[PDB]
Design a binder for this molecule. Structure first.
Ligand SMILES: CC(C)C[C@H](NP(=O)(O)O[C@@H]1O[C@@H](C)[C@H](O)[C@@H](O)[C@H]1O)C(=O)N[C@@H](Cc1c[nH]c2ccccc12)C(=O)O
Ligand SMILES: OCCCCC(CCO)CCCCO
Ligand SMILES: [Zn+2]
Length: 660
């Protein structure tokens, strides 16, 4: 009651009743929230996810600041990692020395002072395996897309100190984040013993030039959607002809030690011409520059762990782009904190209920699969079969709630009191070794690419698995006292979204066992592609601040938004079918079935930086929040019936798209 009444108030707070739902439902649902909530100090884009993440951080402080020392090695190591970084009386006493020292062990750089050595693949090997850096290219170990029960070596593009290749390329002419990034380079060049700006500026400029070629050679993420077409497996002998600049067998044999690599090693390469282009770019440029580039990468990875002269540098630039290390600790040692996190935040009740809600969403999804007009029955049968085989994890991975197993995983990491920078580096080397050690092991589903306190969720095509961290199994997504309409509208939609990823323009290319391999007739694939073109056409109709929204670019996450809204509503109808209507909320003027659509929209209430929107509109595969709402609701007949949106109001398009 008082919980219904508080929840009603916050619903009502957020809306803008001056706006008509059938005109713009997002404005109607969030216009109040938008206008009230301004983008705060430390943030450039704010909303539900921003909000809940920060609630969690604050919980992580009290967990980490224990007195009783009544926790496991792994948990104890996070406490140590935390204290170590929080002791900043110590960090101001060390200054640049830690990093400024590390460099010379590596052989120094022309910023201090002269530099001339034959040490290239050596320092390349070190920074990649010891400091978890990725200049030139990124190397790692994950499931073989075409043989999901194995891991393989993977070489991909990397090495840009900006978030996206287009900041190097567009911005030259459209606002100079280049000025702001050279600055930042220059000042860090000072902090690490570079003296005269006339001496730093040029050096640091050449790194910028090289970093832009990296970006020139780099491949636009539109030419990197479709895995079938960019997956290229080569032998290590084929890689050596392809990119002769690196001596690969020695290189691989050193970073994948203790595993032996011979000429027949399989290596998945996502762009052959890139790697060719890297090699030529490596063999063509002078070595000091090659060295200076490599160290710069090292400094970008590492500067966060030095003093408040650097933080200032990082802060300043991010205004152009001390909870601080509760983040860092979660980032690196998040599975270390998980047990603490879920003891505090996660009723085990919650797991059981979340498990029933998942069953119910699958059920509904499958009932849509059975009924889909664009597939023949044979294709519908294969799809159900892959649906049936989707594996789910809730809250946490099992192994973390067994201290014997969690301590084993973290046994080779050692955290030292008061040595934050050494602690970090030690972690980087440890983290690299965990990935390297997977090369000859089987992938399994109990291994997550997200820690439990994260406010997010995902699907893996190679494990055919949907994952929900305990961190998102929170309000507004889930609350066990909350009306079902609101639970099916929050978490229920998040679930359907993940299920639907099993079948999107990417996930459909992988079969039920997680393998990239045709498992439909081409005819059904041609038929799938036609449904999807509707959502391309649809979402390219949207614009933001006088600029289009990209319908091809956002297709996958739109397909998942649409399948999941729809599965969640059906599931909620299923629940009402079995159980009967719950009561209605009071101040609201709204039934439960309307509440469903409203709750959904209020999850996506958000504000963001005017620059961010021009940018997300090219980098984010997710649609802008408002068109996530509007694009989804607009394909729902059931949304329109329930808000009685006339025959061709904005929110009620006659060209409705439907794939899943
Ligand atoms: C439906 C939502 C609860 C979770 C949903 N996860 P999903 O899109 O399946 O997958 C996400 O996006 C993919 C492109 C990435 O490759 C994944 O690893 C993951 O980040 C999502 O849209 N996430 C967005 C929005 C978001 C959720 N939690 C966040 C926390 C911080 C920032 C953004 C988010 C994102 O991660 O970008
Ligand atoms: O049950 C197997 C768990 C093994 C845990 C590691 C596997 C990585 O794929 C990750 C742990 C985090 C190290 O940074
Ligand atoms: Zn998604």
């Amino acid at each position: 009651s008082e919980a219904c009444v508080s929840v009603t108030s916050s619903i009502l707070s957020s809306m803008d009743p001056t706006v008509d739902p059938c005109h713009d439902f997002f404005s109607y649902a969030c216009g109040g929230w938008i206008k009230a909530n301004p983008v705060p100090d430390g943030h450039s884009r704010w909303g539900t996810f921003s909000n809940l993440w920060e609630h969690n951080q604050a919980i992580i402080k009290h967990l980490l600041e224990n007195s009783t020392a009544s926790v496991s090695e792994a948990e104890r190591k996070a406490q140590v990692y935390y204290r170590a970084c929080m002791n900043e009386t110590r960090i101001e006493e060390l200054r640049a020395k830690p990093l400024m020292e590390l460099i010379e062990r590596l052989g120094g750089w022309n910023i201090t002072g002269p530099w001339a050595k034959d040490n290239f693949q050596d320092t390349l090997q070190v920074v990649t395996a010891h400091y978890r850096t990725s200049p030139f290219f990124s190397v790692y170990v994950s499931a073989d897309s075409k043989n999901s029960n194995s891991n393989v070596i993977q070489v991909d593009q990397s090495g840009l100190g900006l978030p996206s290749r287009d900041y190097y390329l567009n911005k030259t002419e459209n606002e100079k984040v280049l000025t702001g990034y050279l600055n930042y380079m220059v000042q860090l060049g000072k902090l690490l013993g570079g003296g005269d700006e006339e001496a730093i500026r040029p050096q640091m400029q050449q790194i910028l030039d090289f970093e832009t070629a990296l970006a020139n050679i780099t491949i636009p993420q539109e030419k990197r959607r479709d895995e079938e077409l960019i997956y290229h497996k080569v032998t290590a002998a084929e890689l050596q002809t392809l990119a002769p600049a690196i001596n690969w067998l020695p290189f691989l044999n050193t970073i994948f030690y203790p595993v032996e690599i011979n000429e027949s090693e399989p290596i998945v390469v996502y762009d052959k011409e890139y790697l060719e282009q890297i090699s030529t770019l490596i063999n063509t440029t002078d070595r000091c520059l090659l060295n200076n580039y490599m160290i710069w990468n090292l400094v970008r990875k590492t500067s966060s762990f030095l003093d408040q002269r650097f933080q200032d540098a990082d802060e300043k630039f991010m205004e152009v782009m001390w909870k601080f290390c509760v983040s860092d600790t979660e980032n690196n040692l998040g599975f270390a904190l998980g047990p603490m996190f879920v003891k505090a935040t996660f009723a085990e009740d919650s797991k059981s209920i979340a498990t029933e809600i998942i069953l119910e969403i699958k059920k509904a999804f499958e009932e849509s699969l059975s009924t889909l007009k664009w597939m023949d029955e044979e294709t519908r049968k294969s799809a159900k079969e892959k649906a049936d085989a989707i594996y789910n994890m809730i809250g946490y991975p099992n192994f973390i709630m067994d201290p014997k197993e969690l301590d084993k995983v973290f046994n080779d990491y050692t955290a030292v009191p008061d040595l934050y920078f050494e602690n970090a580096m030690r972690f980087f080397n440890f983290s690299w070794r965990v990935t390297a050690d997977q090369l000859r092991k089987a992938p399994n589903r109990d291994q997550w690419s997200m820690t439990p306190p994260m406010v997010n969720a995902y699907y893996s095509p190679t494990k055919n698995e949907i994952v929900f961290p305990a961190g998102i199994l929170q309000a507004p997504f889930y609350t066990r006292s909350s009306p079902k309409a609101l639970n099916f509208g929050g978490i229920g939609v998040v679930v359907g979204h993940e299920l639907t990823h099993a079948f999107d323009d990417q996930g459909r290319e992988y079969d039920k066992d997680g393998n990239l391999r045709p498992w439909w007739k081409n005819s059904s694939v041609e038929a799938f592609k036609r449904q999807t073109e509707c959502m391309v056409e649809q979402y390219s109709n949207y614009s933001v601040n006088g600029e289009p929204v990209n319908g091809r670019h956002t297709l996958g996450e739109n397909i998942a938004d649409n399948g999941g809204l729809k599965a969640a509503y059906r599931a909620y109808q299923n629940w009402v079918k079995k159980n009967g209507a719950e009561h209605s909320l009071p101040t609201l003027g709204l039934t439960n079935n309307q509440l469903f659509f409203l709750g959904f929209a209020q999850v996506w209430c958000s504000v963001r930086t005017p620059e961010s929107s021009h940018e997300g509109l090219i980098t984010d595969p997710h649609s802008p929040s408002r068109f996530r709402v509007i694009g989804s609701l607009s394909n729902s007949k059931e949304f329109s019936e329930h808000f009685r949106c006339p025959p061709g109001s904005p929110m009620n398009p006659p060209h409705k798209c439907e794939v899943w």
